[PDB]
Design a binder for these strands. Structure first.
Length: 248
RNA sequence: AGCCAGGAUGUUGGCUUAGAAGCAGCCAUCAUUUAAAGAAAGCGUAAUAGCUCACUGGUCGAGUCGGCCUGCGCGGAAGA
RNA sequence: UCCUCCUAAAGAGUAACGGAGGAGCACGAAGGUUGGCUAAUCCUGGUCGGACAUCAGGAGGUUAGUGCAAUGGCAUAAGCC
RNA sequence: GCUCAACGGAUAAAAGGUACUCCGGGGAUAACAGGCUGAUACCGCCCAAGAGUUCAUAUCGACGGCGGUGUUUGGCACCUCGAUGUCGGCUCAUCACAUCCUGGGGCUGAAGUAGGUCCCAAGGGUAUGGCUGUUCGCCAUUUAAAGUGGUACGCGAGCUG
RNA sequence: AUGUAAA
RNA sequence: CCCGCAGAAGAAGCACCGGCUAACUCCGUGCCAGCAGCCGCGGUAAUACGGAGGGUGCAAGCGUUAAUCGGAAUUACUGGG
RNA sequence: CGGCCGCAAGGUUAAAACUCAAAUGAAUUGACGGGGGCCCGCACAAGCGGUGGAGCAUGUGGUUUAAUUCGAUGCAACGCGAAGAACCUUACCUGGUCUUGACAUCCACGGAAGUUUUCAGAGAUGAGAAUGUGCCUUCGGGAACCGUGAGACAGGUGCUGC
RNA sequence: CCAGGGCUACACACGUGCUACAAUGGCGCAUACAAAGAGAAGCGACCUCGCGAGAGCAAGCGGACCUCAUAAAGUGCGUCGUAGUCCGGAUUGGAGUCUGCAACUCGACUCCAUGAAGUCGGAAUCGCUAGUAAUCGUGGAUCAGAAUGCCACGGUGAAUAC
RNA sequence: CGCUUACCACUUUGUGAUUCAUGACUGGGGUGAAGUCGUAACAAGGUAACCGUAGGGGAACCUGCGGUUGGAUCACCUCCU
RNA sequence: CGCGGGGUGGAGCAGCCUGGUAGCUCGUCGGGCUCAUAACCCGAAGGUCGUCGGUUCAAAUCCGGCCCCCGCAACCA
């Protein structure tokens, strides 16, 4: 698919046990960087908020190329961790969780034409005071944009043109703000659906370090490695999910 | 210029095998029978089929078809 | 306030809140005379040395320079020692 | 001895407000309007990629261009400063069609109704309330329609303020 | 100063 | 209500099994599915979830839910500080 | 919230909804005190010679690769397991092979075991040629060795020191 | 199971040791003093050759006799005059020797030639109270060959503890 | 019988009390194996704590005044009864 | 384009006025101190002063030209 061949945004965020989960989020950045350098992908750190004892709390990173999103679709969700940590003086198995969002490109086709043939321009007389000027005048412009319903009212100066330029700048600013607000709501409504609450619930993937097991909740794989997984080579987990996803 | 005629057999052609087949787009834009036919300019079909023009015959039988230079005009040219 | 090109219609002159820019200095020498010389920019070769330091050769011709922003002029040099 | 730089230099020596103002004047010079033009605005046309299951031309139409009107903002000050009262509202209207409806027709991407676009046609009609002083606009409900403009953005020797 | 969670 | 016909012929389920409180193992997941009146289990050796076997309890009823009293002397007059 | 008092701040009386199976008081034993008293250790004081500045040797973390085998990873890991990685060791990887097997036992059949030598292949192996043919005779068999076939199994330096 | 590669890779950091940065020191000659050990598919006298690592021949010893095995710092004498220098020895090239089937990744040793950083070390940190620190040499386990590591022995040998 | 008066239901008007839902916004309360900042209380908790009151500060809180030990130390001063 | 402020480690400022020297702070990396983090200490990198030309014995500086960032870019009757 055309969308597939697209690049991606990876957003790795810490959940339960934010001290430990930052350490696992840094290692997941290491996981997907070792998976990305194996197939020659470009990794750029756009934003990374550090933790306390190492790692990172939130990582937003662009990966560009030819086919990142179509090859990393099934990574949005949770990751449980059973591990014996280093920030402990007791030596007990603790569980943490990390949440990973995978966003597509969605390339910015911004600034549509203002369409003055579709703009309704009403140049009528002004309210306010101080001059006859006002009386013989007009000097007040209201411009309505029909397919959105945005009205711009300007009664600033004595002349229409110097108010025409202000009215068109306010039209451009309000249309750009209303489009970018819808785009940021469309980002957030998908990020709230992909990223859950961040709790220790089962969300499609596990990481069982003392057992030596990787057991996902979809396509029940039982790979007993944790050494060909921690250094790239994530083909055996991602490929059969794609195999039984193409059947639907 | 009008008028009864013709305006073919493989071309379901190889093409991305779901089909583009004279006429979406590719390129090739063959060759025979030949009074004549472009492997096609348009209409119409999922594609066909079909309908015209290209061109060639015949009745017909005198002038006709398309460009350049200008003069005077036509329309665009609708107010309180 | 003053200087330089156009505007400005081939003598002089000529206006606009016209189009481009500068000056309110400097010089005991950069002035006078005499004597002598011709650059800029490229090419080749050469120790540091490299596009550009200096040297030798060749092209080139006053596009260089004339203290200063511009015009005219300059080898008989007004340029350089 | 003067950046007396307002630089042919009124004093050696000087900033502001007047809507409390006042006088001699000016259309030599502005505001409101009338006048000339039409950069702008509105409308019409030429070319044509393209949108439209095909298909520029049912309806649109980029990139470009040519015209009409004097309805908006504009430009110049030709008339007015020994006086032309301007906005909005009430009453009273008049005219042009670049027609909102009614009427007669053509195309349609018009099965009928309901439609889109275009031509002729000004004979008649062309809202009611809230807000805002507001023209205008939004809302609520009708209507067949809630037309655009000119007439000193009509009308104060007709009326408020 | 601080060192969150699974006897 | 009594007599006769025929043939074991037509007639057994429900809850619980860690403690309170009567009764034990195996398999399947794996702080997930889930149970639970309280303490609470399940984080790959579960007498606590699901299934099987076995047992326990009650019986044409068995569990859950709702209400009253007792235990609760945790409304104390009997019978508290 | 309501009533009353007060100039105010506010005071007095005084609930309900909802959550939890704890909250509390006394006292015992350990832990700790930047609490006190006492005592000890190169613990502090005094000095000696070092490390950290340089090169080499080794190990680890990290990076890369086919693996850079695995464990140890605060004192109590880091010239540690390893009292010694060219092959061997090797548990890792690439390539080629074997599967009741390289190693332990049972059944049936066949063959002294062994030695020398040659061909192809990286070699394991595959294909051969000679020689030797005993220790007890139920002599259809033995006590070892070797090859074939089937099942029991063997094997694992694979995981769990929770 | 076999052949090869890897465990020795390298932009970086740390731990532990050796050699140093020199004149109580380097070089050359002469010379004195040890203990503890190991040895047979081993130690390997003596003689000869090679500048050399070692090679050829070949006694003794499974051992208080035989071998490894000349102990070094220490002493005398000569030189070097405080310079990155006659200190230090990394790295590199050539020719080599031992072992092993094979020394290229990836062993040890010797010669020639080159001969860097380093001129006493930042924050900070370690061990020691005696034959101890510090310095110097030797042997063994591992092992066909392969340590500065480990174990063990000996020579000189302080200072401080109020 | 009819009329008229007195009692009088349904209903209407005016003004209050009480109660139930709803109401933009705002305050405090309770829960949440992870979020940000500070370490205020438990040792003399590193400024002893607690209570009442007034003020201040992002916040545990701080400051002043009054009360209480539901607080440690009292072989470091010197000299002692 | 016209006017103004400028271009100094990765970043913010001194230092330009008034010439003789590249400086400070935050930040990055690495090592210590702690069982670990924070704090603290030490060391290293980093800019030639946006660029070019001229005066000067000497331009981070004085002046001019070019490039880049930000702000003001026609209004009050």
């Amino acid at each position: 698919d055309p969308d597939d061949e697209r690049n991606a945004f990876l957003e790795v965020r810490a959940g339960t046990g934010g001290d430990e989960a930052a350490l696992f989020a840094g290692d997941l950045f290491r996981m997907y960087s070792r998976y990305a350098e194996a197939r020659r992908w470009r990794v750029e750190i756009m934003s990374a908020s550090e933790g306390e004892h190492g790692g990172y709390k939130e990582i937003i990173a662009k990966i560009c190329g030819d086919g990142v999103y179509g090859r990393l679709k099934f990574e949005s969700g949770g990751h449980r961790v059973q591990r014996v940590p280093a920030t402990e003086s007791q030596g007990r198995i603790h569980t943490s969780a990390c949440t990973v969002a995978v966003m597509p490109e969605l390339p910015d086709a911004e600034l549509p034409d203002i369409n003055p043939a579709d703009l309704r321009i009403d140049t009528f007389r002004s309210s306010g005071a101080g001059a006859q000027h006002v009386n013989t005048t007009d000097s007040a412009i209201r411009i309505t944009h029909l397919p959105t319903g945005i009205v711009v009212e300007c009664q600033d100066e004595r002349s229409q043109h110097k108010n025409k330029a202000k009215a068109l700048s306010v039209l451009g600013a309000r249309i750009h703000a209303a489009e970018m607000a819808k785009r940021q709501q469309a980002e957030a409504s998908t990020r709230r659906n992909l990223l859950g609450s961040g709790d220790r619930s089962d969300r499609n993937r596990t990481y069982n370090f003392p057992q030596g097991r990787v057991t996902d909740h979809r396509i029940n794989l039982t790979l007993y490695r944790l050494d060909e997984v921690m250094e790239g080579k994530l083909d055996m987990l991602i490929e059969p999910i794609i195999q039984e996803h193409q059947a639907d």
